[PDB]
Design a protein around this ligand. Structure first.
Ligand SMILES: *[C@@H]1O[C@H](CO)[C@@H](O[C@@H]2O[C@H](CO)[C@@H](O[C@@H]3O[C@H](CO)[C@@H](O)[C@H](O)[C@@H]3O)[C@H](O)[C@H]2NC(C)=O)[C@H](O)[C@H]1NC(C)=O
Ligand SMILES: *[C@@H]1O[C@H](CO)[C@@H](O[C@@H]2O[C@H](CO)[C@@H](O)[C@H](O)[C@H]2NC(C)=O)[C@H](O)[C@H]1NC(C)=O
Ligand SMILES: *[C@@H]1O[C@H](CO)[C@@H](O)[C@H](O)[C@H]1NC(C)=O
Ligand SMILES: *[C@@H]1O[C@H](CO)[C@@H](O)[C@H](O)[C@H]1NC(C)=O
Ligand SMILES: *[C@@H]1O[C@H](CO)[C@@H](O)[C@H](O)[C@H]1NC(C)=O
Ligand SMILES: *[C@@H]1O[C@H](CO)[C@@H](O)[C@H](O)[C@H]1NC(C)=O
Ligand SMILES: *[C@@H]1O[C@H](CO)[C@@H](O)[C@H](O)[C@H]1NC(C)=O
Ligand SMILES: *[C@@H]1O[C@H](CO)[C@@H](O)[C@H](O)[C@H]1NC(C)=O
Ligand SMILES: *[C@H]1O[C@H](CO)[C@@H](O)[C@H](O)[C@@H]1O
Ligand SMILES: *[C@H]1O[C@H](CO)[C@@H](O)[C@H](O)[C@@H]1O
Ligand SMILES: *[C@H]1O[C@H](CO)[C@@H](O)[C@H](O)[C@@H]1O
Ligand SMILES: [Cu+2]
Ligand SMILES: [Cu+2]
Ligand SMILES: [Cu+2]
Ligand SMILES: [Cu+2]
Lengths: 371, 371
């Protein structure tokens, strides 16, 4: 018998999440037969990767950051690498892939196709990782994703003292205040210390309230990845209670995707905004360029997982459920998203595909599950 | 001794507006003391144009609808005419020119560059016209702008019976319901009966609440202009009392521009939305494609006039006043507009220009006044 209310105890909620996740795993694996149980892939918590497993994933990402970019130079002058190709299409489409009916599915297809690049162009044969925020909400610096060792996605940014607070503005609502974290400078430890962020900033929120924005964020702007790990943000938005809340208290797709992303004006940024802004720095604090932070892919692995859990809890009603339009917060107004709506990743990978073919992890081009 | 509170009598409010406009005229001509009294242009009510002067203007617009487009085909494949060049750039920039700090200035520059094309490519030597909404709020079908004669911008459209209401949505707020007008179909008469609208639809609101959106609204879609004149929209949002309230109750530029465009959630679409949607039809009900309705230019003449009046009531504080950001309703968040923000019209006409050179009708490229 599944839980129905999220516990306020962290240990309790974590066990509730396991139960629901196991429920969804059972639902997926039982119904599967192109995708079969025999060729079904499994995505796992970063913490369950062995040291060699972690290093194989990291090395494949590094490979992508070394290979020439496919995007025609005249459409994205700043692109240099295959990794940049994914950042550039995200930047290019930010205003029709967040707070839209396509947000969840687009990102599902996005990370799938990023995974395909690792496998087909960088000889990656491991499992797709996800970052379970709940386990790190008490100390982000100790997260295996961000501890700075050679099995992490590099570490914190170097310490910059006396940083003012972050002030997140959307529309005309009052700013959401956030502390600035423990870093702020370049990330100079771990396997990405030599990584060059090449695109943006498009809309970079800064300590103190300012926002930096390039004239054209697709032009060349080589610089260091910065971070300022902010545990306090995870403590507010990404604890195991908040994760289970999101799954159990959302009765339709609208409430789920909006609770996940944060209801504008509500004071909360959800698990999705909480994971992003907990990284801090650059592009961590830039909704357009966020894939430029290597932890993006683990973050959205967990996003896709929580959606997949929520879907499988009431499959018949939820698998193909869509709500919202084709424009950011429906500004300007645009038609409702439908199963016939087509999305694409530009020159990053793959091709145009209908929403219809993205709603199940065991259908269309998808054949995977979460453990 | 100027009015300070708007009157509810349409007769008194009309005289109040006349006093405020006459004050603004005095202020501007006094300021003019390369803009001089000897070269200052006067923009005038369409109702003040003689029959010959009206036909002179219409014929120049028709000339622009026959001259070949400048836009590179690969950027706007549906463009055919110089008129299309203006429609195309508006479509392309709609999301950064409405509910932005640049809204008022951008449209001032837009209609001036349209005037440039009339004067330099179609031999126009007359005055720029404006549509005084308040004088037609009692019956739009008798408006000299919309009466369907050879001195109108064409008139009403073919009858469509038993139409549903227009339902205007923005972000989350409940719909503003508008009646669907006394027409519906292609214009039946007047100078633009055979005029072909080539771009869009991009986001065309329809009777009953649906919206039509082309996959790419910059590709070729030749069709008639449709109209459904809606006097009740003018009665609700564009009477002389509503015009005077906008001017006299707005104590800063944020409030002025937002009251003009309609505050989301307020139930009102302001004089700006009222003028647009009162035309009904296609592209009248399409925020991206609206310059495709030939009355657009007279509508935005009045918009600019009302801004000019408001500026001249306190020039020291209002001449150069700006508020807002570079994105529609600041979704997603973007930096504040400043006097150094640059706007441009693509290939429609002219070069890039900074906000600081747009704030006065008697500075920068501008040397005109309203009577
Ligand atoms: C709609 O708005 C977009 C964004 O402002 C406009 O995009 C701009 O288009 C031009 C022309 O394609 C791009 O520029 C230059 O062309 C030369 C080759 O002649 C190339 O070598 C340069 O690198 C550059 O691409 C420009 O970069 C591009 N800007 C952005 C931000 O993408 C578009 O032209 C507008 N469409 C219409 C119909 O006005
Ligand atoms: C950003 O998105 C736009 C729209 O999807 C892309 O524009 C297409 O670009 C190709 C190649 O220049 C054109 O043939 C199409 O006509 C364009 N479509 C539209 C609707 O304009 C653009 O290429 C994307 N840029 C990147 C870097 O992905
Ligand atoms: C999943 O299936 C196993 C049997 O294969 C069962 O023991 C377990 O209780 C199931 N989990 C849930 C949450 O139903
Ligand atoms: C914010 O930007 C302004 C200029 O717009 C600058 O003067 C100020 O120092 C900046 N504030 C911080 C905290 O960096
Ligand atoms: C925009 O201007 C307001 C003042 O009206 C200021 O408080 C805010 O910080 C500015 N926004 C940014 C992103 O700097
Ligand atoms: C405008 O100036 C004229 C001429 O000086 C004057 O007669 C009139 O009263 C003025 N109008 C206003 C509203 O100040
Ligand atoms: C969008 O869907 C809602 C129901 O979720 C519907 O009421 C509305 O009319 C739709 N919008 C359009 C523009 O058709
Ligand atoms: C509105 O759109 C829906 C969805 O396509 C359609 O079923 C309905 O018939 C449309 N109504 C009108 C009046 O066009
Ligand atoms: C367990 O720990 C979480 C943080 O991970 C708290 O938010 C919760 O209230 C409980 O103390
Ligand atoms: C209108 O009223 C004002 C009051 O200040 C006078 O200054 C002016 O002469 C006119 O009578
Ligand atoms: C203003 O408008 C009202 C009706 O809207 C009339 O009663 C008045 O005479 C003036 O035309
Ligand atoms: Cu995204
Ligand atoms: Cu994200
Ligand atoms: Cu406009
Ligand atoms: Cu307008």
């Amino acid at each position: 018998t599944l839980p129905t209310t999220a516990s306020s105890s962290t240990a309790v909620a974590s066990s509730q999440l396991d139960q629901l996740a196991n429920f969804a795993y059972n639902v997926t694996t039982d119904s599967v037969a192109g995708c079969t149980l025999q060729n079904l892939r499994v995505r796992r918590d970063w913490r369950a990767f062995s040291k060699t497993q972690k290093k194989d994933y990291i090395n494949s990402v590094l490979c992508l950051q070394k290979l020439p970019s496919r995007t025609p130079a005249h459409l994205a002058p700043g692109a240099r690498t295959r990794y940049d190709d994914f950042v550039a299409t995200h930047i290019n489409q930010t205003q029709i892939i967040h707070y839209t009916g396509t947000f969840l599915a687009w990102h599902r297809y996005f990370i799938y196709e990023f995974e395909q690049a690792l496998r087909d162009e960088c000889s990656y044969t491991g499992d797709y990782p996800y970052w379970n925020w709940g386990a790190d909400a008490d100390n982000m610096e100790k997260s295996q994703v961000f501890d700075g060792s050679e099995t992490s996605m590099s570490g914190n940014g170097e310490y910059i003292p006396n940083q003012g607070d972050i002030k997140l503005l959307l529309g005309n609502y009052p700013a959401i205040d956030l502390p600035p974290g423990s870093g702020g400078g370049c990330v100079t430890s771990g396997p990405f210390k030599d990584y060059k962020l090449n695109l943006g900033p498009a809309a970079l929120s800064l300590p103190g309230g300012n926002m930096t924005a390039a004239a054209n964020p697709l032009t060349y702007n080589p610089r260091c990845m910065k971070r300022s790990l902010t545990t306090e943000i995870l403590q507010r938005y990404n604890t195991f209670p908040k994760i289970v809340e999101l799954i159990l208290d959302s009765d339709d797709i609208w409430d789920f995707q909006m609770t996940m992303q944060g209801v504008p004006g509500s004071g909360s940024i959800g698990v999705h905004g909480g994971g992003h802004y907990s990284m801090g720095g650059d592009p961590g604090r830039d909704v357009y360029v966020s894939p430029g932070d290597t932890a993006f892919w683990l973050h959205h692995g967990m996003i896709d997982r929580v959606w997949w859990i929520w879907q499988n809890l009431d499959l018949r009603k939820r698998q193909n459920a869509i709500s919202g339009t084709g424009t950011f917060m429906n500004n300007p107004a645009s038609p409702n998203t439908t199963l016939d709506t087509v999305i694409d990743l530009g020159y990053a990978n793959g091709g145009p595909i209908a929403m219809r073919d993205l709603m199940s992890t065991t259908a269309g081009p998808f054949c995977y599950v979460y453990l």
